[PDB]
Structures are given as structure tokens and as C-alpha cells.
């Protein structure tokens, strides 16, 4: 009995909202690789189509859906069609002068989504919440104080939320990426590419795989003692 | 007195694909529970202890489980012992690329040499002695290209209580984020875990209700729980993860 | 006399008790012109009588700062009669209360904002809430209040320092007030067992930090959060 | 007798570090509030140009020689104070020992640095005990490089700082003792001074106030945490970075 434990989600359904790319497609990936049912989404149909083709074409069950995590409605409709033609998601991922307005909207789509699906893990009295956290998005200043704040409001977020619900076996953790091969690091020259890779101990840019396999972690029984947390994903650079 | 004790199925968990791994203070709790855990993984596990019997009963329980590997003396506080241990361990099962630093410098240790018992002289002594052991073994990672360090917090035990956890933690995540920094363009994670109140033969002493009260999830933690995010961190899934301090604490913070 | 505040206007909201009265009385006491607020009349009054008694110039005003129109029109009011607020002080289910709360200071703060840019000058100061409520909740609703002032200043310290306007925050422990006397004696008593100095806080002692602030000797402070507890440290 | 907010008449304070920049300032804005100044440097001339600037500065003090890495000196340093100034109540820490710098130097620096502060932290406050009444106060060091290495070393020297200065407080509480820290960014020093226009502008950019702190405003803040209106901060680090903030 030693080397036979479940590490692995058979029997588990997953929702991991903005799956159509990046980051989001790597960690469906990961979690129907380790045997959960995932309904990954988007917030349009074509997107919601290209999760649905992925998920056949690396043999993962689910389903690709459109959800507006901003909408009340969106969330409460959603939650239903999954319920009736799937059943109750148990591990939900949250992937989908500037800065207030976006990190408070963000913050508040989180609270709306993790709200709707804390009764199904209340009755299942267990449950995965995973929070993703911003990939760092601009170069200047600006960059650095969005990225900062959305990393802080996270951190208290998740940390309060984790209290929350803690009684009823619930974990409630965050991943907070560095810099990530995705669309903003991909569209600077070589030089500037190298440069910003001085910031980063292990001088290379992080994959979304490398995200995925920590969130994967985290939705396991053997992460049943981690709440409240955020793990860095980012190398080596640290920024706040 | 022998202070070195050694000791056809293909499991899907054997990741760390015959990989070494070194884990000091093996014999009881947080550091056996890692030692089996890396076994279970699939790595060469040489498992330590200040003493020879401790080190007989990481042979034993090795054996027991199927784990390949050793239990060896060895005393992180000394420059000797850190030097002919890795030296030992080189000649007779390689290199380690995985090192878990759960051995902690003691009350008891500095005060039979008669340095002082205060936070200060704890905390020091102790983060010397992760250093002198990771310095040692980071040749050998430099040389391979590939490394595992994890360095494991002290579990909570009044004010002087609370004082000494929270000085030790501070120390612990400023000094695994430094020594990450440094070694990282060698391909070389330097992270760190953060236990809380964990199930240990030292807990079970109205008092433990009082507590759990502090405790979200309302349970003391397993020393399996603790093992299993070491043996992640281990992994090559959590290879972009270095320098970060994962708390395992049922969401019990204490600053 | 460095720590003159002379020829300066300062607004700090919630003013008539407590850690916000001491805050009014202190920036006085320091030379400037302070305009109190409270939520109603009454209040306002008690502002204004307290600060005649103690010597001080300025006003007590009524600002509601859930709202946009009672924050522009206050805003309005106190550019005509006293001048532009170049020192700000915000004195005035952990979701809906953080989240609200942090909207307000949003709100505030940039409304004074564009008189401090025209004066290329300012200090905008936070007060985070006081320790002092039950079991869980209280410690949970606290530290997210705290996490949630702790990142908003920073950001909007980044947001505005081009323009040499500092951004800070201070942080209370458990202090003497209206609200704490009379918690019962359970938990002051564990509540004083955390504090390494063994005793509650005056509000003046909050004052005098964030008249420090609003110096100029604290010109390169600036995205800072001051814990100002008595060494208890609650995350 | 006299009682005034930032009034420190009648205190003796020591400074490490004092014969030049920010512990230079520290002496001073100390000796403007009336504090007894004792300023020390690890040389004979270090400490002749500490009483030669407080006596410029019409401070009441003296300079002294102090090698905070030996218990000798400290010991000895201390002895002396006491039988011709007084008990020294309030303490400040500067004096930490600084192809010159990479990544790896961290570890050695910072160890040493904060065995002293316990060395001379805990000398001085047997008298702090009996006076039932102090305050320590820790200087964190001044960016001083521009790279990874810079930052590495910097952030490591903020960690120590920070946590060493928060377990003293704890410690020493309820002797109404205040242990605090000052954590500076970019000062203006020979560090900074060195730097080539387009490194200068461009480490500026990284600075929200868009300009390097003065010696002088470290100074202040120190000057209130010494002051009777700081007696309920303890235990904390206040950084004085201009926004500049890394860890
Ligand atoms: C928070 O650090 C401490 C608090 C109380 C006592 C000792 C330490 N720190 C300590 O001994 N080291 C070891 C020396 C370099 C270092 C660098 C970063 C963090 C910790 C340390
Ligand atoms: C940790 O902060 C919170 C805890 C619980 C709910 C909300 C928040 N945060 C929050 O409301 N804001 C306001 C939105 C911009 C923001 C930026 C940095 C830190 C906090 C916040």
C-alpha cells in the first residue's frame, strides 16, 4: 500500500474557465490527463468549439461551454447545464491608473463564481478552488504596478476565501505565474527577450505545462493539508 | 557501532527514475514520512541521523517499505561530518541531486557547547547549517546540470513560542529565496515548506480542541501531507517553481 | 519646526472621535488647516466646536464617501471657502465590507488628486481599521482589510509619484477607543496577552504617525504601510 | 523639568556609523532634537571627524571608536559611555561592514551583519531594562549595485533585517523597549554618483518619486521613531524607497 494512492482525478469533474488557450488549455489538459471530466470555457462559441475539439483530440471527456464570469446569469445558468448533464463540479479553476478597475473586476468575478460553486462542495464536503493569477504583462512601470496589485488582491483574496470554507474540506489555493512563453513575451526581438531573461534566475521563460503540473498538484488529495496558499510559478523573479 | 547501513515489479510513481536523494533527519515524523515518499518516487533514498541507531532504524524501515537506499550518521552543525558523509555517499551510491533539509540545529545542541538557547543563536545556528549542507552539495548539481534543494520549517510549538516559529520562518523563506537566486542559472530549484501544526508523537500531550479552533480545516496535519509537497517540488512538473515558501498549515497563518 | 504643516489644508474624513478626532487635532496642533468630516450634521458641529476649543482653524463638513456627489460637491465646497486639500487623511461578508470600503477610497482619493497635481504636491494617508472583534470572522474580515490596504496604497503610491505625492497607510493594532472599552474582558485580556508591550494603544499615538507622514521629512516614504500595534502582528 | 513631541533633551544616544552619509545625518538630526550624541567609527580618524561635525553642529557628544564585531569593543565601548555620558537609551545601527560584487556574497555579509546587531543590541540593553525605557533602531544597507546580484544581496540584507528586528521586539516588549528598522532604497551615495547618465536615468525610471532619497530623509525618520510619539511602533520596518520596492 505504500507505492498506491490516488494522485489521480477519475471521478472528478472539473471546471477550468478560459481554456481555449495558453495557460487555461494547458491545465484542462493536465487534469483530464489525470483522469477528470473537464468542461473547460470561453466567452464565445467559437472558443468554447476550440476547447470541445482539444479535448476529443487528446482524449480527455467534457465539454468546451460559454460562460461570462461578470454576469450573474451566465454563472447560474452554466452551473445548471453542467449540473444536470455532467453533475457538480468539485474542482473549479479561475483563469479567466488602470489597475483598480481591472483587479476589482477581477476580484469580484471570482467572488461570483466561487460563491456559485461552493453549495455542490459544501454537499460533497470536499473541494478544489485554484485561483490563476496574471502572467506578467507589460515592461515599464505600469506593468509592474498592475501585475503587483493583481498579485496582492489575489494573495488576500485566496487567503480570506481559504477561511472560509475550510471546515468543510475545501481548499482554496492560487497560482501566481511569472513570466510565461504565452502572447506578450512571444511578440519581443531576441535581445529584449534575453534581457528580461537577466531578471530570471533560471534564465528561461516558464511554460504553461509548468503552471498546469502545480494546479494539477494542487486539485490532488495529497495538497488536502494546503489552503490559503499561493505558489509562485516564475523562476526565480520576484515582484511586488 | 556501524554508522552505515545499506539496504520484479515497475511502479507507475517512480519518477525520480533512480535519482538520489539525500534526507537529513529520517528516523521520525516529517523526515521519515519525506524519505518513504521519495522511495515511493522511485529515488535512491540515504536517509540521515546524529545518531547509529537512528540510522539503523532508516535502514530498517527502508527495507520495510522496499525503498533502495541507506541510513547514514551525519551532523550538519560540522564541517567533517557534511564532507566524509558526501564523500561516502559519492564512492558508494553517487551524487544526490535531491537534498531535504529537515535536520535542525537543536535547543539542546548549542547549549552541551555553551553558546546561547535565544531565537538569535537558533535561528543562526540552524541557517548556517542549511547553508554548509547546500553549499556541499550543489558541486555535484552544478556538475549535473539538475537539482533539488527543499528545506522543511520548524512545526509550531506561549510568546517565546511564537516569537521563535515566526523569526525561524522569516529566516527560512529570505534565506531559500537568496540561495535560489544564486544557483538558478544551474538549473537548480532552491524552495522551501512550511509546516503548522502537524500530527507528531510531540502533539498528542481541552488544550488540542483550543487549538484546532486556530485551524480552518480543523484537523492537524498528517506528516504525509507535508511529504507529498516535497515530493512534488521534487518533480519535474515544479521545475519552474524556485525560491518560494509553500506553507502547509490547513490555513493557519502566523506572522 | 520641520514638522510645520503651516499653509497647508488638510481633510481627514471621520473626524469626530477617536483616532480620527486625534488625527485632526494633531495636524492642527502641527499648524494646519483642517476640515473634519462626519456623516451627519451633528457630527460636523462636534468637529468644528473641538477644534476651536483645541486652537485649531478650519471646519467640520457632512461627506458621505460612498458617494460621488457628496464627495464632488464637499470637494467643491471646501475649494471655494478654505482651498485646495493637499493632505488627505481616510479614516472614514469580508467581501462586500473590503470591497466597498477600498471603492471609497478609490473614490476620494482621486477626486483630490487633480488639485494636488496642479499643486505638484500631496499626501494622501489610509487608516486601516482597529482590532477588535470576535473569534474567526473578526480575525478574518481584519486581515483581508489589512492585504486589501496594504496593496491599494502601493499601487496608487506607483500610480501618482511622479507628481511628489505620497501614498501611505497606517496600520493599528488594538487601540483605546469608544469601540474597544468595553469588548468584553475575555477577549481585551487575549487581546493584551499577543501584545509585547502589554497595553492598548492611545489614538494619539496613530496621530502622531501620520503627522509624521504628512511632513515633509517624510518626502521619500512613500508606498508604505505602518503597522502601528505594539508589536502584535496579525496575518 | 521639560516634555515636548519630538524633544530628545536629556537622552544619550549612540549612532554607528556615524562619520559619514546617513549615519552622519542620523547623528545630527538626533543632536538637532537634543539627544547627547555619541557617534562611532571602526577608525581614530573616523571617530576625530565624528567631534569635529558635532561640535560644528553645536551638538553635545563625543566620536568614538567601535568595532561592533568584537565583544572587546563592545564591552569596552560601552564601559566608557557609561562612566562619562551616561546609559545610552536610544541606539542606532548602521555599522555594517559593506570585480567586487555578485550574487553569491549575500550570505557572509548578511550573517555577520546581524550576529553584530545582536552583539551590541543585547549590550545595551541592560541599561534600556533598568531605565525601563528604549529604543533601537536598524538601518537596512543602500542598493548598492545595479544587476541580479545587486538585487539578490539587497533583498537578502531586507529579509534578515526585517525578521531580526521583529523577533527583538517581540522579546524586549514589555520593557517598553522599541526595536524598529529603517529601510532605505536608492540614497544619494558614491554608489549611485559612479554610474554612467543613460544607467542613472534608467534606474530612475524605477523610482515612482523619479529622483534618489536623501541621507537627510532617512535621518528624519529615525528622528521620530526615537520620539515619545512613536512609542506604539514596534517591531516594524518602515521603508524609505521613494516607491521603489524590492524583495
Ligand atoms: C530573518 O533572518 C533571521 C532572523 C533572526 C535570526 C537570524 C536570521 N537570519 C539569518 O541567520 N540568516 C542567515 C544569514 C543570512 C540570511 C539571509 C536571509 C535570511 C536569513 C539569513
Ligand atoms: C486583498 O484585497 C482584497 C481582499 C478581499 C476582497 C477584495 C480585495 N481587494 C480589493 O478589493 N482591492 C480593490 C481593488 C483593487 C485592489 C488592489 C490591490 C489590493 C486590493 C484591491
Do not use: C
Not at 472528478?12 to 491545465?27: E, H, M
Not at 499561493?230 to 511586488?240: E, I, R
Amino acid at each position: 500500500n505504500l507505492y498506491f494512492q490516488s494522485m489521480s482525478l477519475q471521478g472528478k469533474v472539473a471546471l477550468v474557465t478560459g481554456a481555449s488557450r495558453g495557460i487555461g488549455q494547458a491545465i484542462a489538459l493536465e487534469l483530464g490527463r489525470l483522469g477528470a471530466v473537464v468542461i473547460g470555457t470561453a466567452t464565445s462559441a467559437s472558443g468554447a468549439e476550440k476547447i470541445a475539439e482539444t479535448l476529443k483530440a487528446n482524449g480527455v471527456e467534457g465539454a468546451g461551454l460559454v460562460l461570462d464570469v461578470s454576469s450573474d446569469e451566465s454563472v447560474a445558468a452554466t452551473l445548471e447545464h453542467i449540473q444536470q448533464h455532467l453533475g457538480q463540479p468539485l474542482i473549479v479553476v479561475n483563469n479567466a491608473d488602470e489597475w483598480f478597475d481591472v483587479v476589482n473586476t477581477n476580484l469580484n468575478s471570482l467572488y461570483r463564481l466561487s460563491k456559485a460553486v461552493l453549495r455542490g462542495m459544501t454537499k460533497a464536503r470536499w473541494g478544489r478552488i485554484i485561483n490563476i493569477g496574471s502572467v506578467v504583462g507589460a515592461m515599464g512601470n505600469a506593468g509592474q504596478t498592475n501585475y503587483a496589485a493583481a498579485k496582492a488582491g489575489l494573495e488576500g483574496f485566496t487567503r480570506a476565501l481559504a477561511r472560509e470554507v475550510g471546515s468543510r474540506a475545501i481548499t482554496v489555493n492560487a497560482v501566481a505565474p511569472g513570466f510565461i512563453d504565452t502572447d506578450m513575451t512571444r511578440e519581443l526581438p531576441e535581445a529584449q527577450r534575453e534581457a528580461l531573461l537577466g531578471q530570471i534566475p533560471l534564465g528561461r521563460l516558464g511554460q504553461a505545462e509548468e503552471i498546469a503540473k502545480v494546479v494539477g498538484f494542487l486539485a490532488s488529495d495529497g495538497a488536502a493539508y494546503v489552503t490559503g496558499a499561493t505558489v509562485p510559478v516564475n523562476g526565480g523573479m520576484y515582484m511586488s
